[PDB]
Each structure stands twice: as structure tokens, then as C-alpha cells.
Design a protein around this ligand. Sequence first.
Ligand SMILES: Nc1ncnc2c1ncn2[C@@H]1O[C@H](CSCC[C@H](N)C(=O)O)[C@@H](O)[C@H]1O
Ligand SMILES: N[C@@H](Cc1c[nH]c[nH+]1)C(=O)O
Length: 321
Amino acid sequence: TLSLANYLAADSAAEALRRDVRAGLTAAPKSLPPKWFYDAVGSDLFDQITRLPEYYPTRTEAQILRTRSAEIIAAAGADTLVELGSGTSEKTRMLLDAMRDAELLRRFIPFDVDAGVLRSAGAAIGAEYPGIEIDAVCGDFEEHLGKIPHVGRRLVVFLGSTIGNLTPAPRAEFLSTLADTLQPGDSLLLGTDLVKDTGRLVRAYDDAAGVTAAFNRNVLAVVNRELSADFDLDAFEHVAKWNSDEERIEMWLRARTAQHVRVAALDLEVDFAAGEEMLTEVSCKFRPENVVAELAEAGLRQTHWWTDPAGDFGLSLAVRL
Ligand SMILES: Nc1ncnc2c1ncn2[C@@H]1O[C@H](CSCC[C@H](N)C(=O)O)[C@@H](O)[C@H]1O
Ligand SMILES: N[C@@H](Cc1c[nH]c[nH+]1)C(=O)O
């Protein structure tokens, strides 16, 4: 009853991954793709982040899920739960319980770039819900959504405001593509962190424990290990900023001094100037009405909207137009 499909394993997929890292490192303003945070070490660092006092999103969303999962399941009526950027799927157990309770649960399809997190969560869920079929998919949710099985009536969930780690142009492409993988009867549950006080927003990405910093820097450890690079992690400092124009948090890594870095697997040497900054992640924060309009543009209609009392975070349920 357990399966794993691995689409990131192909050299065709590897080439695209490496091409995107190369483009980031060779652009006039440097960047790295957010997906490279998530090797085994990074997946655990994010798990640490979810427990920080500063990082309100996980517990806020979990509280909405704890109190609204029945409602969500009743509206979706799905027998199949698809989770994008699933990670450890800890919040997802609330959804799985509610589907099981409703006597609908037949299948769980976790989808992640990290196959380790898939094998762990997959084996766990497989045991916690005997008789369920598990179809783990290792892929890039910007490239491999078409590989998610079309079986049954599906609730696709994208929690944790991961959607905000895409800038508006690829975000629109992603949502349009996602919409086009949905069949009649399918649903999207989307978590979106909302615009709020920016002290709160910036602190959630710049905790006093240094955890987010370590998580940010680890992207250099991943590149170092996997692409034969020689970034000096000590040479770069974590920077979190509020971009008010784009209404998004931005994580940067800034060079303390001039750095000269080879990435051997890419046949690539790059340099940083003193004080030069590299963009490692964006975290877009949303206004409620813009979420409605973004879904609509993609060909999706918001049918349900749930928020916490303080309006820190929203969950949307959407169907095809
Ligand atoms: N491009 C991509 N394709 C597939 N998975 C991705 C991805 N970019 C990041 N991820 C995965 O998506 C998750 C984002 S962190 C979110 C974890 C969990 N869903 C939660 O809400 O807490 C991580 O597990 C990461 O490994
Ligand atoms: N998806 C998470 C990833 C993250 C947490 N902290 C830093 N990055 C977010 O945008 O909030």
C-alpha cells in the first residue's frame, strides 16, 4: 500500500535544478532558490523554526485547523488528501483525522522536494492510519504537479504560507497550473499568512535564538555538499527585511568581506563584494481580498475562508471556476 515516485531523480530534472542555481549565482543581483534550504539538515531546522516564540504562523494555522478541520472536510468531501510541500505533515494529521472520522479517507499523497522527509512522514502516516494507501511523490511543485495521481475526489492542501515563497509571476503560473490539474469535485486548501505589524513579521524571521539564521546559512552548506562549492558560512550574515512595496519579508545573506566562491559541479566561480547581499527567500504576506483575486486569476473560486480571531493567518478553500 506504500509507494514512492521520484521525479527529481532524472538528469533532466537535475539539470533544471542546477541551471536555476547557476542563474541565481550569476545574476547581477544574486539569489538562490528556496527549495535548496531543504536537505535533511534544513528540513529539521525548519521544524525547529515552527516552535520558536517569534514564529507565529505554524501554531496560528494549527489552531485554525484544530477547530475547523471538520468544516473543511465537510465542504471538500474528499477521499484523497494531497499535500504540497508536505514536510513532516504534522498539521496534516488533523485533516487526516477529520477525513477518517467522516469515513472518507482512502489515500494520502505527500509531495515534497525532500525524499527523506517523504519516507519518514510516509511510513509514519502509513502506520497511524492502517489500510490507507500512501503515494509519496518526490518532485518540484513548480514543475511536477501533473504527476500527482488523478484518482478519487481530491483535497489538495498547501499549508504554512509556502505559496508566499514564490514571487508574483511564478506564483501566478503555479496557481494556474495547480488549477489545471484539478478535476471537477477537487478542492484546494491554501494557507496564507496575512499582512500585519511589521515588527512581528520581521521578528518571525530574525529570532533571538539564531535558528532562522542557521536555516538561512544552511543553504550554503547544501550547495557546498551537493554541488562541490566552498562557501565560507562564517563570512555571511543573516539579514531579514520588510519590503513594503512588495509587502513581503526577504531573507538575505550578506558578505562581511570580499568572498570568492567556486561551485565545481556547475563549472562556476562567483565573487561577492564586501556588503553585497544575496536573496535566499521571499515570504509574501497577503491581504484577504488579494487572495480572492489571485485565486480568481488562476481560474479558482474561493468558496470558504477561515481565520484566527486576530486575523493573523487565513485558510482558503477553492474550487475550479
Ligand atoms: N519547489 C518545491 N517543490 C516541492 N517541495 C518543496 C519545494 N520547495 C520547498 N518544498 C518543501 O515544502 C516545505 C516547505 S516548509 C512547510 C512544511 C509544512 N508543510 C508546514 O506547513 O509546516 C518543506 O517540506 C520543503 O521541503
Ligand atoms: N515557508 C516558510 C519558510 C520559512 C520560515 N522561516 C524562514 N523561512 C515561510 O515562508 O515562512
